[PDB]
């Protein structure tokens, strides 16, 4: 693919961790990624379904300090099930090539490959493109990492409403501690 496509980045917006919800950081549901072999997984399909106590913030924390770790994030697709994800949005649109980083109090887009130097991003994942449009993104972290880096993905279902239930906002925080 052309470099115009792979470096497609959107700097014309900013967000916070809570976004448009009124959920403070004290009230987040924080939990760790699932450790399956050397693959760390944030699966949002169950976590973001409309609940009566919605919107919640579901924050999946990926802490990396081992080499060659695969990170996989699943964001449930609009219309994958009826009603449950009808208004879901994901940010950045060009994840995993584009990630959010914390500039001051705001999250803004940055190229992940510019952020971590030996980064491995496959263009496809099980023959579907590596993009939340197909519901799964994946990347592999380098053999060594000099400087600690933190970045974010958003999978936000809080605009989805099903009767008395509202979907949840999902956050992935990836924290790469220095290793190697």
């Amino acid at each position: 693919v052309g470099v115009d496509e792979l470096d497609k980045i959107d700097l014309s917006y900013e967000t916070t961790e809570s976004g448009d919800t009124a959920v403070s950081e004290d009230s987040y549901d924080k939990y760790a990624s699932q450790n399956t072999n050397k693959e760390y997984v944030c699966d949002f399909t169950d976590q973001l379904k409309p609940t009566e106590s919605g919107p919640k913030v579901k924050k999946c924390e990926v802490k990396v300090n081992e080499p060659l770790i695969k990170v996989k994030i699943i964001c449930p697709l609009k219309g994958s099930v009826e009603k449950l994800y009808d208004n879901i949005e994901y940010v950045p649109k060009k994840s995993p090539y584009v990630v959010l980083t914390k500039e001051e109090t705001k999250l803004k887009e940055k190229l992940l490959s510019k952020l971590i130097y030996g980064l491995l991003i496959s263009p496809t994942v099980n023959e579907k493109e590596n993009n939340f449009k197909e519901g799964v993104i994946e990347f592999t972290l380098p053999p060594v990492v000099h400087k600690a880096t933190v970045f974010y993905f958003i999978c936000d279902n809080s605009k989805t409403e099903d009767d008395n239930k509202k979907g949840n906002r999902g956050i992935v925080e990836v924290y790469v501690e220095p290793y190697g």
Partner: antibody, heavy 120, light 109 residues
Framework: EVQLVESGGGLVQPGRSLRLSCAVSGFNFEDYAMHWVRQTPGKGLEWVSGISWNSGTLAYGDFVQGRFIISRDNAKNFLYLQMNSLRPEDTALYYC?????????????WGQGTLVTVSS | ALTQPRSVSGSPGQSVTISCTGTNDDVGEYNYVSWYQQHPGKAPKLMIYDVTKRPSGVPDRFSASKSGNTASLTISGLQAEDEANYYCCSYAGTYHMVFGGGTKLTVLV
């Protein structure tokens, strides 16, 4: 009942800066997303910027390119747009508008506009 | 960036349809299409929200729909007061909005 009054337009040379203000009344401002939209008096409507109720999200039209800053004061019920490095093609009438929602989705009520001319 | 015809016209009682074509990242992606009326010298007025819905007070001769990347506004039995410019508008993703270029509606005899 609802009204929105924009202020702060005028003439600037290219490269200079203006700050637009929008005072609102008749609705509970702090619960609503807000928009800036421009209209060149010979042309159509063009979305400039928007901000959610709690400033949790904000965005800009693609011509803005880092030059403008939208912000809001939910206590004084004011919407602001700082416009830096203005270009002659930024010459337009500038409206503020509230949203139907607390997030950016659909402009609802609009102000009268303030005219911004950029020229040497 | 949404594409509208420059002008439509009709006599009172006639029907007009104004199309609004975007892309699969705005009109085709969301059900957040809105339509605005603007009289000469006045501010815009919201006529349609969420593709098909009318705010309270908009006469129901205004209706609208969407198919794929194209939204449409229909005025059935237009009146003299409907002579105006009409603008479609859509959510464009990532907290952006985008407007159509506008259509002038002329009411004839």
């Amino acid at each position: 009942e609802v009204q929105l009054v924009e202020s702060g337009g005028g003439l600037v040379q290219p490269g200079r800066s203006l700050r637009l203000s929008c005072a609102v009344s008749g609705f509970n401002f702090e619960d609503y997303a807000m928009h800036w939209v421009r209209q060149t008096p010979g042309k159509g409507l063009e979305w400039v910027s928007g901000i959610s109720w709690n400033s949790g999200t904000l965005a800009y039209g693609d011509f803005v390119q880092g030059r403008f800053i939208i912000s809001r004061d939910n206590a004084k019920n004011f919407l602001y747009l700082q416009m830096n490095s203005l270009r002659p093609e930024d010459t337009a009438l500038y409206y503020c508008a509230n949203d139907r929602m607390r997030w950016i989705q659909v402009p609802h009520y609009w102000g009268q506009g303030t005219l911004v001319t950029v020229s040497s | 960036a949404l594409t509208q015809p420059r002008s439509v016209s009709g006599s009172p009682g006639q029907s007009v349809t104004i199309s609004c074509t975007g892309t699969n990242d705005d009109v085709g992606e969301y059900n957040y299409v809105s339509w605005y009326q603007q009289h000469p010298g006045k501010a815009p007025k919201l006529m349609i929200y969420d593709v098909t819905k009318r705010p309270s007070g908009v006469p129901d001769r205004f209706s609208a729909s969407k198919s794929g990347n194209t939204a449409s506004l229909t005025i059935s039995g237009l009146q003299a007061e409907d002579e105006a410019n009409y603008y479609c508008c859509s959510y464009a993703g990532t907290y952006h909005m985008v407007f159509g270029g506008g259509t002038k509606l002329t009411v004839l005899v």
